Amino acid sequence: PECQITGDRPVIKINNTLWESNTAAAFLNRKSQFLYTTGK
Amino acid sequence: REFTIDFSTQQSYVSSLNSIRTEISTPLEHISQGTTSVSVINHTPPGSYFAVDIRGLDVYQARFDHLRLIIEQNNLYVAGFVNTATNTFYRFSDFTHISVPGVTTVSMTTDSSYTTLQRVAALERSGMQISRHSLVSSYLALMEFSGNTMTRDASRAVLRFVTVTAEALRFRQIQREFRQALSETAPVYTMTPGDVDLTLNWGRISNVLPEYRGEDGVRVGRISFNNISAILGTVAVILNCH
């Protein structure tokens, strides 16, 4: 139970560095920055 | 089975922990230098536990020897503590499935979680001090405890003993930092935010390290290991994430 937070992919290898997949996903979920200035 | 953790010297303490690691876990082939490895807990049947006998709290005398810890083997959780002088096992509420023969079992209303223990102890682990003195004081608090509801003093005692047994088994970093307190100059170990961060991310670390195959680094949340030396200096034993 303690092993998994969410998802099913333990790691992602990025540039010879092993990332916890959930950590990478948590900074790759950024929308195009200009959308902060457009409004609703 | 039963194992002793001997706090007599820095060397006896480290040797005690390494004996336990060698018996209950298996080295990862890709994170192993010489005799030092990250090891994975061997799979045992659900409910399996081992006992830890606390010894050597007083360096020069054979005393304070009635404290035993009951540790669930597959995850190194502390299920409770045994007073061997009264033959009484004080068991946290969340370990009903741990059955210890020969002892009187007191099912406590208190659960084992750090959130609960820190509330009852009125003590935060970040900044918590541990010295030889406070382990003696912790021992005496646990030997004086009775009833089925944890007190402030017993909770502080459990927080300290869990740190220097189960968490040190998991994390070589905590082992190395705390063992300074056992020397003749008797300094104080102060648990750091980084120490706390390790203990709260053991599962995440356990899910990542079995995938390591010689990469230049490992990243788990805020934790970074930039070479094998960094991993070995920090993590000793991980869960078995099959």
Add this chain to the structure above:
Amino acid sequence: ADCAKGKIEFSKYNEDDTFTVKVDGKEYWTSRWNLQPLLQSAQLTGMTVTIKSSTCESGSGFAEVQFNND
């Protein structure tokens, strides 16, 4: 209604600037731009998502999706 629950099999950015995901063997598209990076990160980690909509046939639109810890 719950149209589909599972991992995102693939995703697609469309020429009309909408975004499609395939879940449980069916495709669904959304015009909500804020969902695009959120869905792609669910995809890359294997997150189980639940597509919710009034029309659940494959190829229809959605604008409600639950991100689960499964």
Add this chain to the structure above:
Amino acid sequence: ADCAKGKIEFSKYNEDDTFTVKVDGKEYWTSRWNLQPLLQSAQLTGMTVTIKSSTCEGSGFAEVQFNND
């Protein structure tokens, strides 16, 4: 007031472009679009969030603390 404190059990993008999270079995929604990626990241990494609001009823919220624990 601190309405909830714990890890995010699920998050949900809503049809009206609001955003819902469930913490310890209770659901809270927000209409601040900036919070959408921040809350999903907290869910992915297991951050402890504290939802703060004047009404803790499932009403709306627009203030949340993100802790590393």
Add this chain to the structure above:
Amino acid sequence: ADCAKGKIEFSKYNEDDTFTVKVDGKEYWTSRWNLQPLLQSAQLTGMTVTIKSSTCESGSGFAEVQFNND
């Protein structure tokens, strides 16, 4: 049509605010700003991407792409 499929070999933010990727030895550019984080995330995580466009010669524009974990 499917112009190119494979891993992103490089990406580039251009001075006119368009975005270029090289896939399977061919370069393509898009003016859709929402595609920028999706393509860079795909590049970093090793997704297989499919570039789709009515013209497929190297150097041309696109606004549709499929993302697969593979």
Add this chain to the structure above:
Amino acid sequence: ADCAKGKIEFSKYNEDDTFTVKVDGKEYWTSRWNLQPLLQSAQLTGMTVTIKSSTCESGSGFAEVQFNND
């Protein structure tokens, strides 16, 4: 001036849509929405940040911050 340097201890999205971080025992807030995803990414990956401002007392505002991997 460099007000504080360290990893982000916690962050807080405020009701007025400003964003607060705690660094080296001191709290600072910013009104720049663009900074929110960058600060939170730094928090969850454990980047070392340097808060820069003409007012360095805890509780002050900032709009300049350096991000280091260590």
Add this chain to the structure above:
Amino acid sequence: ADCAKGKIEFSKYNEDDTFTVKVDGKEYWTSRWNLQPLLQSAQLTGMTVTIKSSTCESGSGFAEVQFNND
């Protein structure tokens, strides 16, 4: 021209809402807001970035940058 090639050594959000990166010992700033999260991801993951600009002196501006993996 290719002005600097290497990993990002630090990044910085500036009070005028531009964004600075240091690459191969030289600093460059951009006013393109979309580059802020893309450059932070590149910095976190150790991508090799190539800053491209008509002026290569440290301190000057840029609006074109290539992202390569290992």
Add this chain to the structure above:
Amino acid sequence: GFGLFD
């Protein structure tokens, strides 16, 4: 005799 890490 603590080796390199203990």
